[PDB]
Short mmCIF file of C-alpha atoms and ligand atoms in Angstrom, two decimals:
data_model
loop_
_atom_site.label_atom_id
_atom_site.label_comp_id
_atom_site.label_asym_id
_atom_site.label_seq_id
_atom_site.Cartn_x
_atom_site.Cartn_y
_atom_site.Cartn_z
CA UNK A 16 8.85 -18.98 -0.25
CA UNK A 17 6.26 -21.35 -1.69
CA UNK A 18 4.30 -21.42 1.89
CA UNK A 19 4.38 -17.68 1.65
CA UNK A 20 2.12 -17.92 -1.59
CA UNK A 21 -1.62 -17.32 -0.98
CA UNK A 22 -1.16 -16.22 2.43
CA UNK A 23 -3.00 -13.17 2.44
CA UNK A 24 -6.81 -12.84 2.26
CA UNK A 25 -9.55 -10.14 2.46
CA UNK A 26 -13.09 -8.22 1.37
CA UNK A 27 -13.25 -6.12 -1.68
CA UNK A 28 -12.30 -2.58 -0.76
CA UNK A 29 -11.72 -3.63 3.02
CA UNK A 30 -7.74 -4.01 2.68
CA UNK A 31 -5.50 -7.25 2.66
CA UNK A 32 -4.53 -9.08 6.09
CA UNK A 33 -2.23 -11.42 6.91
CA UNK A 34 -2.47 -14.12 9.81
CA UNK A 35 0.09 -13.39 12.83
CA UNK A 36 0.50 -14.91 16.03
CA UNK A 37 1.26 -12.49 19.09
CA UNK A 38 2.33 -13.84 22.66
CA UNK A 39 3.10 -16.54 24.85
CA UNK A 40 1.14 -18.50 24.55
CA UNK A 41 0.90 -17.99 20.65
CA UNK A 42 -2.66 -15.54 20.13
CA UNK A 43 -3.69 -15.84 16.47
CA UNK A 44 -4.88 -12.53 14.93
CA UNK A 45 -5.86 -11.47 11.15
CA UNK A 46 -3.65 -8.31 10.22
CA UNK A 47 -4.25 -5.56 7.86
CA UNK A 48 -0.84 -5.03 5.41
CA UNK A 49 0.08 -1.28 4.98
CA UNK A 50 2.49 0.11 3.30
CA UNK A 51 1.69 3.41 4.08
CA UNK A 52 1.93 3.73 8.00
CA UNK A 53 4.85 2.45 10.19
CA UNK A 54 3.01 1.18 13.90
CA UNK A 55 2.03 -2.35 14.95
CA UNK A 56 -1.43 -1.70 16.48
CA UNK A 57 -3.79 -4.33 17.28
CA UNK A 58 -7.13 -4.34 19.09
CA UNK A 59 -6.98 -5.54 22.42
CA UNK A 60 -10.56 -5.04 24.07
CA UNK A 61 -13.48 -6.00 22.69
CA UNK A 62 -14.84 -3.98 20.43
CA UNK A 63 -18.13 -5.29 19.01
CA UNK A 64 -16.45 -5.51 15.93
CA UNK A 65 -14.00 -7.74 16.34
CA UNK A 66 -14.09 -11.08 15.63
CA UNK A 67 -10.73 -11.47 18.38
CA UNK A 68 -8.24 -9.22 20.32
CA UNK A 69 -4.67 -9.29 22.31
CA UNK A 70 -5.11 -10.55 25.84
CA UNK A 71 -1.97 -8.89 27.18
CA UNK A 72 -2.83 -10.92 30.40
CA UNK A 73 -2.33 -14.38 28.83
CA UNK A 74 1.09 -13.28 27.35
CA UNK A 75 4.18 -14.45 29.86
CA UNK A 76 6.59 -12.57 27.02
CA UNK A 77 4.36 -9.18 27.14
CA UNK A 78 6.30 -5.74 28.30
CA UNK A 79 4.60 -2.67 29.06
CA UNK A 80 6.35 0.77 27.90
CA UNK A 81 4.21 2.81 30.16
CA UNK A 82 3.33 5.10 27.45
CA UNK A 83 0.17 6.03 25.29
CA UNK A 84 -0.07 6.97 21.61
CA UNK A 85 -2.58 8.44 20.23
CA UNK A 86 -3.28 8.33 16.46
CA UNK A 87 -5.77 10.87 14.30
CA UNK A 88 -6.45 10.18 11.04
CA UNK A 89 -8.25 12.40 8.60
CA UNK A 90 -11.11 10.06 8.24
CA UNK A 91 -10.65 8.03 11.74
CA UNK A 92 -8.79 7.54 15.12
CA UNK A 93 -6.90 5.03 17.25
CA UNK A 94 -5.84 5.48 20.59
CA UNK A 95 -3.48 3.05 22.53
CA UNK A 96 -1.14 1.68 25.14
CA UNK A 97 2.80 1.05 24.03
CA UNK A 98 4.59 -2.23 24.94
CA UNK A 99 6.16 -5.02 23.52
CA UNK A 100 5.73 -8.66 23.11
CA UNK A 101 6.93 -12.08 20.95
CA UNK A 102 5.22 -11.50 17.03
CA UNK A 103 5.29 -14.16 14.37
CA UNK A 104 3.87 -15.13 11.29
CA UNK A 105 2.65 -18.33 10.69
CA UNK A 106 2.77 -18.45 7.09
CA UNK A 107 5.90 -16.45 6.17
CA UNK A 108 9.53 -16.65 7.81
CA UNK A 109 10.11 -19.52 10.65
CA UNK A 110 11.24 -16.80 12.79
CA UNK A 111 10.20 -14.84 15.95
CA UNK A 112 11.06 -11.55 16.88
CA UNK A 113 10.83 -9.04 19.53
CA UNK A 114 8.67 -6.05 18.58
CA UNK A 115 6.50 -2.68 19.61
CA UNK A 116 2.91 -3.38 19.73
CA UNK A 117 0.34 -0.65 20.52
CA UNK A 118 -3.02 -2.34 22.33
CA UNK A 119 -5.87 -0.27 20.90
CA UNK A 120 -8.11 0.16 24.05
CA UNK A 121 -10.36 3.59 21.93
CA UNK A 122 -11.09 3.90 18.45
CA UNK A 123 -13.42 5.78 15.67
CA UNK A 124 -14.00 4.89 12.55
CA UNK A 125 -10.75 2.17 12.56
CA UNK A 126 -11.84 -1.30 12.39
CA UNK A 127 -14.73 -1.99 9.68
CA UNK A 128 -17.91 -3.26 10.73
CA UNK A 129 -18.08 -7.01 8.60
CA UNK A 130 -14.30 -6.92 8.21
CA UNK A 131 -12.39 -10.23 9.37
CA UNK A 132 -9.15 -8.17 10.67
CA UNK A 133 -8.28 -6.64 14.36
CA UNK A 134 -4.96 -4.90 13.80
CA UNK A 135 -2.96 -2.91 11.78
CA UNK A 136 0.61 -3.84 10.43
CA UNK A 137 2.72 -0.59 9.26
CA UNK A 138 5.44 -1.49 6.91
CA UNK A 139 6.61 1.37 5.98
CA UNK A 140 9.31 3.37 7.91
CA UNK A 141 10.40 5.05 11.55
CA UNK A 142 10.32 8.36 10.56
CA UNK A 143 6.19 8.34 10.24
CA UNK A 144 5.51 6.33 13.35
CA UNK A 145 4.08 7.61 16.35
CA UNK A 146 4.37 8.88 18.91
CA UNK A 147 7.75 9.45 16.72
CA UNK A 148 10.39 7.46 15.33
CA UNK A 149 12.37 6.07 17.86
CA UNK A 150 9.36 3.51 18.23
CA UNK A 151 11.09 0.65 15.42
CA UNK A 152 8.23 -0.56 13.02
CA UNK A 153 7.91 -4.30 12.53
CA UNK A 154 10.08 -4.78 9.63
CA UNK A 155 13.14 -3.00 10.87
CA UNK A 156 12.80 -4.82 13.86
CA UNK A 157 12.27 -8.09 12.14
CA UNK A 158 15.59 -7.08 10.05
CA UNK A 159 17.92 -6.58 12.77
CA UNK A 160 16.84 -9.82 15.08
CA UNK A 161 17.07 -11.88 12.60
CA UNK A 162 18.89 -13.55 9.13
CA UNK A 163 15.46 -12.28 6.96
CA UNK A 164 16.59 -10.05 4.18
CA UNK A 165 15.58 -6.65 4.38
CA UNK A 166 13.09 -6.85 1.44
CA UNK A 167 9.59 -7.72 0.99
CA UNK A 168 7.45 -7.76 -1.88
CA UNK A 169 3.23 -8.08 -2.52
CA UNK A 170 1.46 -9.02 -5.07
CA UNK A 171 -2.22 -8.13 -4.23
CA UNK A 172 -4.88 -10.25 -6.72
CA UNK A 173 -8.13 -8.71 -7.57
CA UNK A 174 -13.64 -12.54 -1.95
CA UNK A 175 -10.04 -11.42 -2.70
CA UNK A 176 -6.35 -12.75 -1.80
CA UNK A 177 -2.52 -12.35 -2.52
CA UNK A 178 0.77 -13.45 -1.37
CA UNK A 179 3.36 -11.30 0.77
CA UNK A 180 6.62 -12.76 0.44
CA UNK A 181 8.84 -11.43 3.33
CA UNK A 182 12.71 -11.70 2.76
CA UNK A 183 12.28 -12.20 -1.03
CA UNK A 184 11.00 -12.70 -4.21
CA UNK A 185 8.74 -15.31 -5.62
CA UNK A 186 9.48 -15.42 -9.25
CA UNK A 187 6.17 -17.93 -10.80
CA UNK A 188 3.97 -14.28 -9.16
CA UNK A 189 5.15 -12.12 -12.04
CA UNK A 190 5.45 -12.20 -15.83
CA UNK A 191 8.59 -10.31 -17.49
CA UNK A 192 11.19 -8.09 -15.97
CA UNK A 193 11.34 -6.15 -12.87
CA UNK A 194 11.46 -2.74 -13.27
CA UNK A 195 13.00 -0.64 -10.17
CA UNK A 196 12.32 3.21 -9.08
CA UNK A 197 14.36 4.87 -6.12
CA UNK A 198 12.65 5.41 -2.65
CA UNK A 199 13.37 8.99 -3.07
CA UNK A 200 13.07 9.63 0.78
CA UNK A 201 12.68 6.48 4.02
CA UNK A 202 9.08 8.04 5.63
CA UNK A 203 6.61 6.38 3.38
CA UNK A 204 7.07 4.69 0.21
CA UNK A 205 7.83 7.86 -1.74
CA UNK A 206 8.62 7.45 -5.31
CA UNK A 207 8.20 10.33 -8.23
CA UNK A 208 6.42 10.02 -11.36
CA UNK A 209 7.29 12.32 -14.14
CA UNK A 210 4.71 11.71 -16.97
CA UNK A 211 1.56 10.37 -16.94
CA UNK A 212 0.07 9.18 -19.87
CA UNK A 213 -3.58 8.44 -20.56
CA UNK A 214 -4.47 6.14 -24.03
CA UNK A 215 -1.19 6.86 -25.09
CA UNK A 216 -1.48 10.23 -25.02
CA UNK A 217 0.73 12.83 -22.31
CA UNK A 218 -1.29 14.99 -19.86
CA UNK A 219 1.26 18.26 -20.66
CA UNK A 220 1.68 19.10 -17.25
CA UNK A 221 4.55 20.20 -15.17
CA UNK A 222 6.11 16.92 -13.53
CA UNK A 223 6.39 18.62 -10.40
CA UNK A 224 2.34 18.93 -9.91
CA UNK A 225 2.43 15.00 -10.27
CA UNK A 226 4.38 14.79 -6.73
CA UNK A 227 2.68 17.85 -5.02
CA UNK A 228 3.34 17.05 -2.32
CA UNK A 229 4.30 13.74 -2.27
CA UNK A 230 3.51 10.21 -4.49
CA UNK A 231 3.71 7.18 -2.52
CA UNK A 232 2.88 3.44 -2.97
CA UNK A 233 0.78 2.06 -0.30
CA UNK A 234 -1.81 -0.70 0.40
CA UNK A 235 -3.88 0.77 2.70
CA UNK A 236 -5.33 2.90 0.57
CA UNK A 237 -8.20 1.08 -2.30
CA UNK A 238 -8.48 4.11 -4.33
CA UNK A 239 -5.35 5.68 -7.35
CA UNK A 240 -5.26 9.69 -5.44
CA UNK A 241 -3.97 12.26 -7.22
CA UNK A 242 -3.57 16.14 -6.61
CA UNK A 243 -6.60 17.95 -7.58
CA UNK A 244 -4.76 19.76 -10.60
CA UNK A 245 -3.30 16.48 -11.84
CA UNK A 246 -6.86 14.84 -11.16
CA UNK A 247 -9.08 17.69 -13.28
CA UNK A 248 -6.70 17.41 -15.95
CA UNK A 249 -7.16 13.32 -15.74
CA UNK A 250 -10.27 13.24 -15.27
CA UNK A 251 -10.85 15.85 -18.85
CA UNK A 252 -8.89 13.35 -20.39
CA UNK A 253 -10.78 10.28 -19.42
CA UNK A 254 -14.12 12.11 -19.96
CA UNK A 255 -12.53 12.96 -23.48
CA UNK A 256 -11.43 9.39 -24.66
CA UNK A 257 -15.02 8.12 -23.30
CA UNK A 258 -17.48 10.47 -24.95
CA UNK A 259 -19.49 7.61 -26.51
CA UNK A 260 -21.34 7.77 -23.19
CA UNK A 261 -22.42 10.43 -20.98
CA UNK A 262 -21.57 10.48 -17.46
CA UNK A 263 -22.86 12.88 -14.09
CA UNK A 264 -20.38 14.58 -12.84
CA UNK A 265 -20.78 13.03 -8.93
CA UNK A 266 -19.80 9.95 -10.57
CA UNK A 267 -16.18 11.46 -11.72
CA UNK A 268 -15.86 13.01 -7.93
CA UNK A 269 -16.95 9.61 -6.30
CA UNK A 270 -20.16 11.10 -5.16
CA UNK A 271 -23.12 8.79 -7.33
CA UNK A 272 -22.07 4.95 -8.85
CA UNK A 273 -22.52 3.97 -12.48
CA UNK A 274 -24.73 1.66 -14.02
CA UNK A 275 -13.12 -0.39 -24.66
CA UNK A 276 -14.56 2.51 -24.28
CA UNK A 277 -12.38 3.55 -21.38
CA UNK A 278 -8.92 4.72 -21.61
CA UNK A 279 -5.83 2.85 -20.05
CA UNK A 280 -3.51 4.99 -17.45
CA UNK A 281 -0.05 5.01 -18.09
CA UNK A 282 2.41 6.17 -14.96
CA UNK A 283 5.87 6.89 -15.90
CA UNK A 284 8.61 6.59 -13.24
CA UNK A 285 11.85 7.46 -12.63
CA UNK A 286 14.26 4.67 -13.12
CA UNK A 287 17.42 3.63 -11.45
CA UNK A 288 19.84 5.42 -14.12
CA UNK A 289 19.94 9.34 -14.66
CA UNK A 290 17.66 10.30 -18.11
CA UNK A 291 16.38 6.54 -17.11
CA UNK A 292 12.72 5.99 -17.06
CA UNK A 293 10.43 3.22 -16.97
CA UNK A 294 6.60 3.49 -17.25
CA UNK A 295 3.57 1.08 -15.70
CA UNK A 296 -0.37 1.01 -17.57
CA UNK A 297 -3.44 0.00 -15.66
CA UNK A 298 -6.67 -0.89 -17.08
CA UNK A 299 -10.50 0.25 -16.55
CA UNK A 300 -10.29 -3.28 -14.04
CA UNK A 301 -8.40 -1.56 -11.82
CA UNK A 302 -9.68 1.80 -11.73
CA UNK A 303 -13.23 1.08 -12.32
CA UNK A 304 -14.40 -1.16 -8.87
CA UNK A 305 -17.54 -3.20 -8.75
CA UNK A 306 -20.00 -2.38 -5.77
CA UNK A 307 -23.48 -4.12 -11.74
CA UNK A 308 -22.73 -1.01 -10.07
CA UNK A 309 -18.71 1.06 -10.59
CA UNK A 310 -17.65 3.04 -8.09
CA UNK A 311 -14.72 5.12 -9.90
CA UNK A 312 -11.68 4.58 -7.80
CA UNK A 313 -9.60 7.68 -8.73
CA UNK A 314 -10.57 10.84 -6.32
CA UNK A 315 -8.89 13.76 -5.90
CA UNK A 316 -6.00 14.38 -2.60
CA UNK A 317 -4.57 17.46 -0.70
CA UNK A 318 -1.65 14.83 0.88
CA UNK A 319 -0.31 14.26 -2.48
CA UNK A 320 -0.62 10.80 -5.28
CA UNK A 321 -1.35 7.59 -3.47
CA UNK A 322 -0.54 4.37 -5.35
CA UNK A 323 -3.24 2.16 -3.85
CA UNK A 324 -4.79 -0.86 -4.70
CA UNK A 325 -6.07 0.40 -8.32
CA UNK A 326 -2.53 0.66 -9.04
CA UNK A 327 -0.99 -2.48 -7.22
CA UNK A 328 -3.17 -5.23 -8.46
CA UNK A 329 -1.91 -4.84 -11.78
CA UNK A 330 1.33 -5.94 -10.71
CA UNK A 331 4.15 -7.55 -8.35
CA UNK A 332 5.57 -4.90 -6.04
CA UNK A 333 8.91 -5.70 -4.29
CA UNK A 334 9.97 -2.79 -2.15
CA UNK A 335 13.82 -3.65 -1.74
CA UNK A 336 14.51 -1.89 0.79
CA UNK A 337 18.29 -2.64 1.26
CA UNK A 338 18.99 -1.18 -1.80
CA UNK A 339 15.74 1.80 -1.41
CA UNK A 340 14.23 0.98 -4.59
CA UNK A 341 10.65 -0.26 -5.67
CA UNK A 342 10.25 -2.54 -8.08
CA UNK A 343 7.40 -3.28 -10.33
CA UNK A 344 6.36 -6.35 -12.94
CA UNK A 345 3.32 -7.56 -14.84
CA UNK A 346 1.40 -9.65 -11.83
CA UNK A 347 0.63 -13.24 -12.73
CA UNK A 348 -2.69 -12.48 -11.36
CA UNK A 349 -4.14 -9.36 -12.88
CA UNK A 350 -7.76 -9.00 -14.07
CA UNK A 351 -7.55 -8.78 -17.98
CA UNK A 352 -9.64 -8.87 -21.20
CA UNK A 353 -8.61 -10.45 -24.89
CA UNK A 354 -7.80 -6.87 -25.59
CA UNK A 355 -6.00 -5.39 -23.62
CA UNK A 356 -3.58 -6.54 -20.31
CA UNK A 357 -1.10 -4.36 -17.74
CA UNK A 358 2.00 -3.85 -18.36
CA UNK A 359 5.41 -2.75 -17.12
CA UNK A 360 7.85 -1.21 -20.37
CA UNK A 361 11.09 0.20 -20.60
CA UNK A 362 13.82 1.90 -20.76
CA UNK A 363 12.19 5.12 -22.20
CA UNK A 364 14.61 8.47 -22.47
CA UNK A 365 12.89 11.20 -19.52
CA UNK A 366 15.31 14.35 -18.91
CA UNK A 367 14.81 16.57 -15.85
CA UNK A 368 13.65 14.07 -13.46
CA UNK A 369 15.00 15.34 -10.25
CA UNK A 370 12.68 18.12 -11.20
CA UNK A 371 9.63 16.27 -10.94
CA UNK A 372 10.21 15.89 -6.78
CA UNK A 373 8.48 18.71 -4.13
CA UNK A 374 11.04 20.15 -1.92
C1 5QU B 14 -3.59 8.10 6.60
C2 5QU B 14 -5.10 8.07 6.49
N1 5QU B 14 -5.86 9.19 6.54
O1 5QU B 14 -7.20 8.80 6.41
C3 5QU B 14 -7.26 7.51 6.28
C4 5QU B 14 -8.54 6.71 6.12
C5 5QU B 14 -5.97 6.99 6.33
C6 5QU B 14 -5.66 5.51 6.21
C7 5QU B 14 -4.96 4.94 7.45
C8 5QU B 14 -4.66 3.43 7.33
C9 5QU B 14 -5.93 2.61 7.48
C10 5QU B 14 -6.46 2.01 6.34
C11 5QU B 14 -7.63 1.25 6.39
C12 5QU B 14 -8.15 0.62 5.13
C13 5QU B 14 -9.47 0.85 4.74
N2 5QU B 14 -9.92 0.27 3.59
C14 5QU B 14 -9.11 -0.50 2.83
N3 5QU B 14 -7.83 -0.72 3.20
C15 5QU B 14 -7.33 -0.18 4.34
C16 5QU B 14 -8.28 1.08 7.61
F1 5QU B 14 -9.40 0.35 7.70
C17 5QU B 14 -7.75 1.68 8.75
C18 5QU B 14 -6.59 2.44 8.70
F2 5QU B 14 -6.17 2.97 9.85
N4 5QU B 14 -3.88 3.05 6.13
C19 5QU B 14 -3.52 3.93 5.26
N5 5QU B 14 -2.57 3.56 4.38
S1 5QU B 14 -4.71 5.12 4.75
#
């Protein structure tokens, strides 16, 4: 897996892409790596943006599915036409595979003007892709063509890079053990927390508001999102254990930047045994993002606690999906001070934790 190291690169709050190679003749393209959606979309018309784009009409392997998808976001769009064609990547597995690919043709507020990607690559599973799931995502079809295990694993570095390891782990990425939590349910990455801790001390809250509706690890979002009870509470706490300065309060909502003194986050997760719990701590590093000007990356959500890039820069995430687990360690990589560093602890006693999930 060594010439999977270092193969992924990016822009500060613009996502992490990886380089793939779609076609016959091979067309290289820079793809963004998300965890939290399942389709293979790439651009495929050019869009002043865009540095490149599929030429279906170069591509002797190219299928079409005669059928359209079209995909609203809450803040964007992508709309596109369904087919399938040869995808590898250069710098992981020396395999090629047969898999869906959706040529964007329309699209608002998708690609990012200044961005060095064209496409999106959804790792996470069938049951969210669209038009529905009978479309395979990447991975499963990756899986099932070939001998590549059916785990990958990220460890995302903090103008920035990382290393996606696909059909293992890379053990010089990640100090300590790995710790593992069950993927409670195969649509996203959905995992539950059931106490979250800030400086050491607990928030007091009902578990079940930490998962309302849903907690999920995924890499296309920048920003830690948590429900907007969970989030006032966090945020009193945080304004609490930092009252040697003053802050506005647009700064706290992510509406105004800021121009030891704050507290480390501690998310406790369930574990792999029952009464089994584990827990992970980020730093101010993560959650506080230069823009010096900060830009405080924790903001409120209606869709339920995202575990974005504030949360998976701290460490090595292998989502093991043949045994539907998630597993996290200290990342080799992590920005640190003298003081104070991530970290990934356990076992720790937690009762009720099937409690803690929305039904
Ligand atoms: C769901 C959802 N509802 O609203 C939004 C904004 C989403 C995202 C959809 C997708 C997505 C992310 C980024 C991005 C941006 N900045 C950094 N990294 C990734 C992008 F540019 C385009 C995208 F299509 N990935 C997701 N996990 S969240």
């Amino acid at each position: 897996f060594v010439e999977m190291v270092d193969n992924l690169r990016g822009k500060s709050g613009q996502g992490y892409y990886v380089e793939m190679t779609v076609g016959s003749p091979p067309q290289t393209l820079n793809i963004l790596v998300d965890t939290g959606s399942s389709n293979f979309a790439v651009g495929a018309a050019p869009h002043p943006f865009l540095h490149r784009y599929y030429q279906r009409q170069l591509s002797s392997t190219y299928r079409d599915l005669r059928k359209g998808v079209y995909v609203p976001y809450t803040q964007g769009k992508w709309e596109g036409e369904l087919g399938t064609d040869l995808v590898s990547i250069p710098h992981g597995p020396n395999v090629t595979v047969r898999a869906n690919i959706a040529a964007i043709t329309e699209s608002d507020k998708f690609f990012i003007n200044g961005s060095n990607w064209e496409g999106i690559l959804g790792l996470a599973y069938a049951e969210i892709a669209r038009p529905d799931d009978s479309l395979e995502p990447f991975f499963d079809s990756l899986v099932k063509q070939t001998h590549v295990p059916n785990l990958f694993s990220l460890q995302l570095c903090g103008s920035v890079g990382g290393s996606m390891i696909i059909g293992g782990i890379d053990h010089s990425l990640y100090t300590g053990s790995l710790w593992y939590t069950p993927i409670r349910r195969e649509w996203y990455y959905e995992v539950i927390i059931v106490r979250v801790e800030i400086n050491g001390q607990d928030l007091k809250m009902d578990c079940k508001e930490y998962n309302y509706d849903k907690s999920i690890v995924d890499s296309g979002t920048t920003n830690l999102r948590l429900p907007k009870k969970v989030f006032e509470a966090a945020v009193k706490s945080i304004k609490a254990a930092s009252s040697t300065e003053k802050f506005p309060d647009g700064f706290w909502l992510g509406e105004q930047l800021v121009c030891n003194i704050f507290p480390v986050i501690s998310l406790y997760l369930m574990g792999e045994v029952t009464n089994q719990s584990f827990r992970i701590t980020i730093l101010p590093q993560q959650y506080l993002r230069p823009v010096d000007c900060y830009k405080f990356a924790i903001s409120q959500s209606s869709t339920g606690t995202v575990m974005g890039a504030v949360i998976m820069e701290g460490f090595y995430v292998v989502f093991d999906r043949a045994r539907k687990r998630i597993g996290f360690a200290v990342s080799a990589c992590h920005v640190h001070d003298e003081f104070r560093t991530a970290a990934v602890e356990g076992p720790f006693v937690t009762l009720d934790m099937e409690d803690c999930g929305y039904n």
